[PDB]
UniProtKB/Swiss-Prot annotation, chain A:
Subcellular location: Cytoplasm
Subunit structure: Homodimer.
Binding site for NAD(+): 147, 201-202, 221, 256-260, 282, 308, 332-335, 380
Residues reported to bind substrate: 122, 146
Protein name: Formate dehydrogenase
SUPFAM superfamilies noted in UniProt: Formate/glycerate dehydrogenase catalytic domain-like, NAD(P)-binding Rossmann-fold domains
Species name: Pseudomonas sp. (strain 101)
Keyword tags: Cytoplasm, NAD, Oxidoreductase
GO biological process, one term: formate catabolic process
EC number: 1.17.1.9
Amino acid sequence: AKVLCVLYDDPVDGYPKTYARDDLPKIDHYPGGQTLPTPKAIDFTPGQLLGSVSGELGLRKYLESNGHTLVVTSDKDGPDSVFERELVDADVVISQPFWPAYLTPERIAKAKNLKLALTAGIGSDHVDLQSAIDRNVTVAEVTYCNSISVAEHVVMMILSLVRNYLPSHEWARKGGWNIADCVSHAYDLEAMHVGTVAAGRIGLAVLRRLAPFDVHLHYTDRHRLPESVEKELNLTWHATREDMYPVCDVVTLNCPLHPETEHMINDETLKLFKRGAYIVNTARGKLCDRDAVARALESGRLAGYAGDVWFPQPAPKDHPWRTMPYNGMTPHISGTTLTAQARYAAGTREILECFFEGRPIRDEYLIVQGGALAGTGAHSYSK
Amino acid sequence: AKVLCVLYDDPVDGYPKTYARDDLPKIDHYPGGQTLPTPKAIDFTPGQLLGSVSGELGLRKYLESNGHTLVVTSDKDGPDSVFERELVDADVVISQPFWPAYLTPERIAKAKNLKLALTAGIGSDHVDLQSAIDRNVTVAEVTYCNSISVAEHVVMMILSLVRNYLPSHEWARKGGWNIADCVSHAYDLEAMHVGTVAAGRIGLAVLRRLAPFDVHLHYTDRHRLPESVEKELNLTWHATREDMYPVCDVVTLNCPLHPETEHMINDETLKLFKRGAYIVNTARGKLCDRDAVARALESGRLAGYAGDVWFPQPAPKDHPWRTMPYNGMTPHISGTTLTAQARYAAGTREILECFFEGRPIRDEYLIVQGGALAGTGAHSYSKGNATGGSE
Ligand SMILES: NC(=O)c1ccc[n+]([C@@H]2O[C@H](COP(=O)([O-])OP(=O)(O)OC[C@H]3O[C@@H](n4cnc5c(N)ncnc54)[C@H](O)[C@@H]3O)[C@@H](O)[C@H]2O)c1
Ligand SMILES: NC(=O)c1ccc[n+]([C@@H]2O[C@H](COP(=O)([O-])OP(=O)(O)OC[C@H]3O[C@@H](n4cnc5c(N)ncnc54)[C@H](O)[C@@H]3O)[C@@H](O)[C@H]2O)c1
């Protein structure tokens, strides 16, 4: 089979020779009991840079040893990219959400041998699910691999916005002190109302981490949590996302991108937010109407916006989120820390082994299979 | 009496006429039961900028109406400063740790009328306590006013350093993407070992906040926590700070600055740290040898250093921590968010009313009283002078 794997470039100064530390912390399983990936073997050492072109997700030996072809490229956008040229006869397409090879309807029609589109991370919205269902393409992703890594990134961003960290670091770096200039836009998080749109793997990890900060917790989801869990975390349930907005100081988005959530944050829904509210979005860029968010920071409606996800990716040089007022943006990296890479590289291999060996792909990993949504796809998406 | 109050300058664009939000969250007391400040009244609206020269900690009406002269200035350094000139006959000196009026042995000796040195914030190390003790000056601070504010800043800073937030933000703002450049130095915090030097009000607030991150928690302190707390947070106790360093991925310093802690992080103790360790210091700058920390980052012994505290304050323009590799520094702001200012501005007024009315100053606020360390000062400090090099 031909495996076409789209990865990001290596660091500008080359593939790293050394790393900052010698080992990675050890984790046994994910919260709730799902086990870490179970490939028969791995050809890398956890901690190495695996999502860049030279890392190849540690898959070359395994594939070539089994008679497959592995094509690795970072050139993915447009009609003349290596990705589009190589796609026509690829049997398996792999890309990461951080540097995604978008599988539009037009690209899936041209990919005449396509049988599996694998996401090396979580979030398969860069793949047209309906064309995959119509073409019988299996769509799978590495469920839970970086859900905790993103939760950490959310808490970090929330505190950063509220405490005015970014601008204050600039003053230090530039030779100032200027305490008043740093703190006239700075508050403590303590006792603020924080709401999450979805309480899935990421959303629930965020809520647990925020609990000791003594904030008031709110949530909404397609799937309401058991009352006993709501009681344990002191959560207030909201049946709709619009009912939640008005009472929150901070809103964090942790739902997938699908037809029901696309453009949920827009000029109309932004009017439901209190003046000086904060939005953190590490889920997907398209959950927000781009210009409406910028207009809300320019007008003082929002006191801050931070996230690591944008639309499209890579974001254009001039994307307005890069420079709008009080932004705490990063390029898409929360789910691609070196720790996380080791887990999804291992799960990408487990899924390929199953797939080539004719064994079932875990259900938790499936998004689309055999002409319909399946497993996590049925739980969390909509076509 | 004459009250000499040193505050930081107003914003470069003027004293704000508007704020980002309409209210502040309401809190009832501090963790463990301590009540918030109880001045008889407050002449400000919580949420306003109070620690700057035009904010005056909301004290002018109260003081002038009671017969006291309030001299407010940001000019605090050197012998030709307004502060130095006015100090000779001030009865009461007020300063905040973020823009500290150093009361060195020399200044205390010239301050013929000084009776009370009040810290509008927490941390009185900018005052020579031995000289205060010698001269019978009362030293008081607004205990607990920003311990939670600071514990939030520590968690923020631990995450930023580990996840390599700052350099990543620079890439986004400059027009880049460069995923590999951002994550070649980024890890998840989950399951790392995190240790705190001291488990007081900030330290313990820090430990409670890190627990759900699933990290292994370690600590050391002059005063051991109760077994149920240790049990509840699954803490590992270390008799010495030198026993704890070696097993930690991240070390956060949360003790006061005094002779026993001054320069605890230096070229020799840095050698006990694992390679790629992180240090967060929002306590005091002088707990660390300045150049030793910069060398450790340059050499790779340390994978990050972040804090908001420096020595002296303000830090010189060329202070090395401003530009060393992998730093997550800010000027001294954690304890002076708009939220914390309302609490210490209220607490400063409560101590003054007590002082002037001949009512007892809360024991929890006392550092030095009647010729000796007293209240919180006997609990958390050791006597000496930490103001050397303040100039
Ligand atoms: N920034 C990053 O690196 C990164 C990394 C991982 C995931 N993510 C994003 O976060 C999403 C969530 O990840 P996860 O691991 O928590 O997944 P998950 O499937 O466990 O959780 C998603 C939750 O969203 C809820 N949901 C679905 N539709 C909804 C709707 N219309 N309204 C409200 N809630 C709805 C589901 O019921 C579920 O509880 C991913 O799909 C991806 O888009 C981003
Ligand atoms: N960045 C800022 O805004 C800011 C704000 C407030 C306080 N601080 C600093 O943090 C310090 C701690 O504040 P807090 O509210 O926790 O005070 P606290 O008195 O409640 O905590 C101090 C803890 O340090 C412990 N300790 C004392 N000497 C020690 C030693 N030699 N070794 C190890 N532990 C020792 C004490 O036993 C006590 O548990 C303040 O003194 C100040 O220096 C910084």
